A paper describes a structure:
Methylenetetrahydrofolate dehydrogenase/cyclohydrolase 2 (MTHFD2) is a bifunctional metabolic enzyme found in mitochondria, exhibiting both dehydrogenase and cyclohydrolase catalytic activities. In one-carbon metabolism, MTHFD2 converts 5, 10-methylene tetrahydrofolate (5,10-CH2-THF) to 10-formyl tetrahydrofolate (10-CHO-THF) in mitochondria, thereby regulating the production of NADH, purines, and pyrimidines. An isozyme, methylenetetrahydrofolate dehydrogenase, cyclohydrolase and formyltetrahydrofolate synthetase 1 (MTHFD1), performs similar catalytic reactions to MTHFD2, albeit localized in the cytoplasm rather than the mitochondrion. The key distinction between these two proteins lie in their expression profiles: MTHFD1 is typically expressed in normal cells while MTHFD2 is abundantly expressed in immortal, embryonic, and cancer cells, but absent in adult normal cells.
Superimposition of the MTHFD1/16e complex structure with MTHFD1/LY374571 complex structure uncovered several differences between them. First, in the structure of MTHFD1/LY374571, the nicotinamide group of NADP+ was hydrogen bonded with the NH2 moiety of the triaminopyrimidine headgroup of LY374571. However, the addition of a chloride substituent on the phenyl ring in 16e induced a clash with the nicotinamide group of NADP+, leading to the shift of the nicotinamide group of NADP+ away from the triaminopyrimidine headgroup of 16e and the consequent loss of the hydrogen bond between 16e and NADP+ Instead, NADP+ in MTHFD1/16e structure was found to be hydrogen bonded with the side chain of Thr279. Second, in comparison with the MTHFD1/LY374571 structure, it was observed that the addition of the chloride atom in 16e led to the rotation of the phenyl ring by approximately 26°, accompanied by the movement of the γ-carboxylic acid away from β strand h1. The shift of γ-carboxylic acid in 16e resulted in the loss of the van der Waals interactions with Leu51, Tyr52 and Tyr240. These effects collectively contributed to the weaker inhibitory activity of 16e toward MTHFD1 and consequently improved its selectivity to MTHFD2, as shown by the increase in the selectivity index from 7.9 to 27.1 compared with LY374571.
Numbering used by the authors:
A (entry chain B): 3 to 242, 251 to 296
B (entry chain A): 3 to 240, 251 to 296
Write the structure that this text describes.
């Protein structure tokens, strides 16, 4: 049976490490702290929870994190005033807009996200940072936090990535598409599947590394898993309890390593955001 | 055997349509002409050839194309000055830097490319345009010209892309990587291969659509091809041969691009199309 990749434990070690860096950066440049801002439009329940988890992580580490919550009646123009203000405020080192925006008005999300200064785009959602990642220019770009966290989970298996066949199910802007790029430039051979893929079960069965980011509860069946695969489940689904996008019971009988839900990718997403925030704080000093 | 995808004939149809568009444009707004600039660093023979092919196509269409060639010893700072000048010249609608740079001094290609204004980046090489393409924002970006030409050749088959398994061999900034994205947002299931891919023959055999962009002459064997595959060969290797072993591949493919006269003419035609598109937007 598969060994469990314990994201809860792994993230803790990352956060302890970040806390020491933050404490150490204070006794290098005094009064200086990493500063994060999180902008929210509307009042989605899941966004409220995820933002709150991120605030807790930043607090424990020493990052000063501000949460701005705009109402559902907010217009695209009002959101842009905040993005411009956060770009200009040299005390803010990174910020992000929690997605999706929950507005009754029509707001161009792509236009909002792409007003974020790329040097503060710790969520890696601007076209500029996406374009660097998608073309293999990894040294000078923020990488989206869920793919970052999935790569770290993969590395914890000690199984090298180069030459393996990776399958990514899902191509969303925040997870699946950057996940493909990250695996590719770590020299996996990568297949991307989506809602138009035919014979999904056959495609999934080719993955030595499998990352599932569909938002469909337990859709990926254990039978589909290649024996010995490294299975990374990004799904967080509320069903009649929380389950992921992989049928966990069947899959753990065939994988060599598997992420549980909860306690797998989710805590790693948050840890990687704090790491990117510290990185933009350190970069700002230079 | 395969039907041949005649890139010579298809590109001539595209260039004639563009010529008539430009003619009509000039009738509607007298004195206006689409303008392209090509910047080159060094004096590579292949670059000289491909640039010359581009200038001739622009001339046939009625696009005014200027070519600026800098010596092998130019500095990054001097290359940047020209890019700034091109960005600021409001009579220039698109421009590109022919790659690779041939310099004696270390010049940061990524910094040079990324100083191009995205609205004039007709080669689609800026990070801004790459990121738009890579995340499916296909209406607000220039797509690189060779992937655009490959997509048009695949569409000439009349077979829908959606649901097919496509294999891209190569991940370069100009061809392989944007090709993956174009096929992905046409709803293919896409596998990307590279020089660390193990069992390349088995990955190629999965491809209903196969695009080979490696620069390794005839390395992709015909026996690896899935029977009935659509086979797109971007290679130009020096006779001139492609990246696919053509004779064996043609036996098994449903459609296949010859080399030469396949992808090559389509690449140039797609550059002209993007140029005319930038000029049209600039009137608007
Ligand atoms: N977004 C969040 O705030 C958040 C928070 C926690 C967890 N998650 C988890 O993170 C992952 C990504 O979520 P997201 O919101 O970024 O995704 P999303 O925008 O909802 O996109 C889902 C992706 O899965 C694909 N897909 C859907 N049904 C499929 C099927 N039956 N077969 C194959 N592919 C299918 C879609 O294909 P198409 O592109 O063709 O539509 C799309 O690429 C999910 O597992 C989700 O549960 C999300
Ligand atoms: N560049 C031009 O001006 C030009 C003009 C005419 C024609 N072309 C054609 O355009 C295509 C791309 O050219 P490019 O300049 O963009 O090439 P490039 O930058 O050299 O990229 C070559 C790609 O092929 C991959 N590759 C090399 N050997 C391989 C192997 N044995 N198995 C699998 N993948 C392998 C490389 O993998 P890695 O990423 O691991 O290195 C890389 O992604 C080629 O077909 C070329 O003939 C180019
Ligand atoms: N801009 C932006 N928008 C977004 N919608 C996201 N996604 C985005 O926050 N996801 C997310 C998922 C899981 C958790 C998480 O902490 N999950 C824990 C459970 C947390 C708890 O309840 O304590 C787990 O799965 O184990 C946090 C964030 C993002 O990263 N950036
Ligand atoms: N910036 C930039 N750099 C680059 N290096 C390229 N590639 C870039 O120009 N390729 C290219 C390929 C083929 C031809 C072409 O016309 N090929 C003909 C043969 C050429 C001839 O023999 O005259 C054919 O295959 O049929 C022209 C350009 C590019 O498109 N943009």
């Amino acid at each position: 049976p598969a060994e469990i990749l314990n994201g809860k434990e792994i993230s803790a070690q990352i956060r302890a490490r970040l806390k020491n860096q933050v404490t150490q950066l204070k006794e290098q440049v005094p009064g200086f702290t990493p500063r994060l801002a999180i902008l929210q439009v509307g009042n989605r329940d899941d966004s409220n929870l995820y933002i709150n988890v991120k605030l807790k992580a930043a607090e424990e580490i020493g990052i000063k994190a501000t949460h701005i919550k705009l109402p559902r009646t907010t217009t695209e123009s009002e959101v842009m005033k905040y993005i411009t203000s956060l770009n200009e405020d040299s005390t803010v080192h990174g910020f992000l807009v929690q997605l999706p925006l929950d507005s009754e008005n029509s707001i161009n999300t792509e236009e909002v996200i792409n007003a974020i200064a790329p040097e503060k785009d710790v969520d890696g959602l601007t076209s500029i940072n996406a374009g660097r990642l998608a073309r293999g220019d990894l040294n000078d770009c923020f990488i989206p936090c869920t793919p970052k966290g999935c790569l770290e989970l993969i590395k914890e298996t000690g199984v090298p990535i180069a030459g393996r066949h990776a399958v990514v199910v899902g191509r969303s802007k925040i997870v699946g598409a950057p996940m493909h790029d990250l695996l590719l430039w770590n020299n996996a051979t990568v297949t991307t599947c989506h809602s138009k893929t035919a014979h999904l079960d056959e495609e999934v069965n080719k993955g030595d590394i499998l990352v599932v980011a569909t938002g469909q509860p337990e859709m990926v069946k254990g039978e589909w898993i290649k024996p010995g695969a490294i299975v990374i489940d990004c799904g967080i689904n509320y069903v009649p309890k929380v389950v992921g996008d992989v049928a966990y019971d069947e899959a753990k009988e065939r994988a060599s390593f598997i992420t549980p839900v909860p306690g797998g990718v989710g805590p790693m997403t948050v840890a990687m955001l704090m790491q990117s925030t510290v990185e933009s704080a350190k970069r700002f000093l230079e």
